[model samples]
Target chain A: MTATLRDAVAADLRSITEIYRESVLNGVATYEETPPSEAEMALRFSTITGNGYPYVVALDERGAVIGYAYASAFRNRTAYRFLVEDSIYLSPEARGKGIGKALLSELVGRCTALGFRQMIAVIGGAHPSSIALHRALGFELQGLMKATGFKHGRWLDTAFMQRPLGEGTATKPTEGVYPDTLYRS
Target chain B: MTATLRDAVAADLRSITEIYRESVLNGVATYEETPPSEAEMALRFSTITGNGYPYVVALDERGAVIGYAYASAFRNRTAYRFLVEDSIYLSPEARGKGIGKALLSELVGRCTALGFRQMIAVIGGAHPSSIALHRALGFELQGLMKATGFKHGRWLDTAFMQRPLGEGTATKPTEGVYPDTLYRS
Candidate 1:
């Protein structure tokens, strides 16, 4: 099951939306209860890519999107711009193919190239596989907030995972290039 | 040396802006590099309170805002609607008089009254006093991310503090009143 990865484009929105719907309705990768419409997903797409964060999709040989990942500002504050949170969703058929690792690895590289210093994963329900996936990719288990969410007739906990990027705060982000340049180390 | 706590009003904007500015430019409570104008602070105030989250101010004998506390959506997502994050700031002179403890404690009670199930404090730089402050008010140190923020010519770590609100995940939030009603436990 070899997979091809590339920057997600507008044309991939439907597949991406379906993949997200699968997770939203059947999984805890996201805490969101409703599946947002494709239009909402489109706005999210433009918003992420427009802001210079990366959004990538894995494709099968037929070029159909099977999985996707994206990074966004961790908190919606100017001071928090240097850090980003990642979200990834895969179609049912796409799981167990090592695609998520490849997708997230590429995502880390993309964010590093964008001058970001930190990547955080606020994983809903602390999905063991998600935790394992992040751990395999240099992310650490930062903390766990138990019963932080209510869903599917029960309470859920959130896992906060963190991974640093290029230079990883070992050096000052070039003052002028911080999310607001090419100063990425 | 006494603090009178009350709901923050429009007139408190200047003091709120200045108090926040003190933290923004002088400390790591907030990561904003520049002090935002009163107008911007006003927008934040309205956005938060308008959404039904609580914003309280501690006033001196003259009824001047000396410290402020508020709760806002932790993350801008649907399922996360049940959780909120807390932010507390005190003027320099107000620091040692238990104002922070009073302010945050009141903030916790207010969020409890608001139907939020969880409150998170993403303490920038993990200031010891701030950590102690949260600890005194029932917040647990979830974990720390080293060098997640860079400011003041050095890298900073973020301390994740978590506290559960009344009925916190022990019961299901009524679908009719979940931040979108009056079902607060």
Candidate 2:
């Protein structure tokens, strides 16, 4: 049976850590230096959930967490609060079976419900599977930059994608949000 | 013989267009929606070069341009003048032969010498080779936002790699920059 989606709980920490470890060790899915411990992962999950944000998981028949997705502040500044960055991960066996799509779709719903205006996805440049998955999920490609990563004695490239969410879909801020004099290139 | 580096001139407009055209078709190297014509590119290049920035080219031993690289203002605000964004593009046949590295190295030197304090490489999350190259050139991992791009039928992740241009880089103003306010979070 396909995995069912739900919010990630404290019990899901071990499987989540395992998922992250596998990706970090064998694939180019993440740039984290080391696999974080389950305890630390649980703390982070708790924090996001506590803040009314998402830390969702997908459970297989045996109740094992097979995949996960979440969203968080895109940047620390107040001006960017309505913009959130998103991530989705699945077990190798669970990939290509629509598990990621389900998780991402749910995550997008949660982000939109939370008043976020933008949802971002950072794909690892070397991972074609991840990139393809995001493409299938309706995310748009905004930019591609070269030679922006250093890992395992080689540099990696990166691509940035974004989706607009919540209220009216405005690319730039509306009037009165910031002074008219302020602008960014 | 390897390509020799030279300062770009008005006459090199056609050669640069070829390089840009390759990137436009490849979908992995550039942000431009399409390659500009020689005349249009000539005007843009003239403006960039006239603004006191370096627009250099790499040519094969036969004097045919194979690639080009340049730096442009990061943002229009005066406070951002010390930060520059860099770009390098090489023909398909010109890659993997050290032309990219040589041109990037030369670009870095010229940018730092020009009084810029920081160089930012906004990479597409899908391009690993670009990330690897930038890392090899001493650029450091800085920032990333997932789903920050929407182009070419899908979302693209963004990886922001940064490097200090010179020693003794100054600190950000305590009052923060214009977009960032002290009263804001």
Candidate 3:
């Protein structure tokens, strides 16, 4: 089989960091001027998954982690609780294989089941690959912010994309209320 | 004759919490269904101020805290250092008096002076007053996310607004670099 999807565990972070580093050092999918260390990546991973959000990875036939995606709080306020943002990064060898789409598609489905109303993608550099990925998954182009990022000696724009989840805003969340924290937490 | 603005102090949080409660419980500027306790508000204050972003309050002739605004990290990632999202809240009696303008204007200037490249306003409910207030300044309506919030038995849209800081994104930040933090920290 091609790359198969599964829930990411702590051991998968080494490959996740490498995948993210490629984007940081050579690509504009992220605005990070410098790649974060593995420790920092671990801390970030815990912050999201520990908060009860989803984090998943794709593995090659040989069981190598080739890509990852996760969802986290859009903004850390109660009113913003129904919203989550998605981030995805793929290994260099995995590009164009539809892994990003598979990863994000899974992420969107999970967050919807988790009772989130909105899923936003803050695509850094307004990078076309990320934009297209989100677009392929029913996300609309909300708008773009010019020169919101600076890296690689150039100014970059940020693209905002959104897709509604489950009943979305069409219905109130459960119990006439949503969890104060993300569902996993 | 006019509202005087100053650096928000710990003592001002009581008034700040009250002002925020009005919006959280009765207004749509924020999506929170319940108002936060003063202690929780204090924790938020420290997080932003401790991170070095600007936070300010406006006072009436009677020395009452009527309104407040602050800038915080748009996203916690490293590449998002050059951008800040703004939050503003005013007392019931303070709305039409231009106190929101006074607070945000000062907040904008301070952030620009601190070398931030952009200021974003995530106006909840697409609330006209908040949108108009941001527009009255130099901010532009980037776009709107529909039905992203559900509260008070209604769906609300969020209006995203943006403005340039000093030189905007025209050139590399000072020392050919910006602070890893928001500057004050």
Candidate 4:
């Protein structure tokens, strides 16, 4: 069996929401309804594509969605423009197949190409798999929010893993066009 | 030797801004501006109290502002209603005397009273003093975001610290409220 990675489209929201629901219902990975309404996940889709963030989806050879990953604004403050927050989700059946790694790699490449200097992964501390995956992808161990989130009648911690992209800040000047001309770089 | 902590008033903006400006200009703690105007800080003041979040200041024996702290919504989303982010600041000259710790302790007390289950702190990763202080106050080391911010033509990292303020979950039949309410013990 082969796996393919491609840019996500509006039609992919159903599958994306399905993945989100699986995470929510089965684990404390996300704090939301078991099946997040289409409206909830649609806004994320819009924000990602609208802000030029990348959403990479991995599909089986038959084009069935297996896992999806995306990056979005880390913060709304102008000071945080160059950084993006990354998130990944997969069908429970898709674990151990490396589909998440493949989707996340594509996401990193696309985000770097978009001129984001950094990518942060905010993972639920209970999910050791997500933490291990991020570590394997060159993300450094950042920090953790201890007992910051509660779900399923329990308090869960959060972890932040970060990856630095591009030439590490030496790639661009600070006061110039602010990356207006570097889109093709 | 008398010190009083009170809800800051409109008249406290300038002095509060001065305390904040030192942190902004020194670059030892924050990376905002050489001196963000009082008007800009006033907006934050308004937002905190407007939404019922706490914005408190400490006055010296002579009624001079020495330190301040507050808590605000972690995210605008309704799902994060019980989560809040906290900030504590002290005039540079007034730090190291336990004033910072006292201010933070007070803010956490108010946060718990506000019905917030979780409190967060996003700090400059390089500020070991702040990190140590937070750790001493039971703020667990959460995670760090490397190069998540840009200032002075360089990338800056951020550190996250968090804590839980209460006991087990409430068994109330009423669902989680949208905006917020002072959590009654």
Top-scoring candidate (lDDT): 1
Model 3 chain A worst lDDT run, 10 consecutive residues: A176-185
**TM-score for all models, in order of appearance:** 0.93, 0.50, 0.89, 0.77
Which candidate number would show the highest TM-score if scored against the true structure?
1
The clash numbers for all candidates, in the given order, read 1, 52, 3, 8
Q: Chain A of candidate 4: what's the TM-score?
A: 0.88
Across all models, the iRMS values in order are 5.1, 13.6, 3.9, 6.6
Best-to-worst TM-score order: 1, 3, 4, 2
- Model 1 chain B — which ten-residue stretch has the worst lDDT? B176-185
At residue A79, candidate 1 shows an lDDT of: 59
Model 2 TM-score, all chains together: 0.50
Q: Indicate the TM-score of model 3.
A: 0.89
| Model 1: per-residue Cα lDDT over A1-185, one tens digit each | 65689999999989999989888899877877778899999999998888888999999878899999999987655556678889888899889999999988988998898878899999989889999999999999989988776667777888999999888877767767648442122
* Top candidate, metric DockQ: 1
Q: How high is the lDDT of residue A105 in model 3?
A: 88
True contact recovery of candidate 4? 0.42
**For model 3, how does the per-residue alpha-carbon lDDT over B1-185 read when each residue is reduced to its tens digit?**
56699989999988999999888788888877768899999999999988888899988888889889899987766667788999988888877987888888888899887888888898889988888889999899999988776667677888999999888877787754445344321
- Considering only the true interface residues, what is the Cα RMSD of candidate 3 after superposition? 3.9
Clash pairs detected, candidate 4: A142-B143, A142-B144, A143-B142, A143-B143, A143-B144, A144-B142, A144-B143, A145-B142
Candidate 2 C-alpha lDDT tens digits along A42-129: 8878876665678889888777898898887654323344567787878888876788888888888887775566777767653667
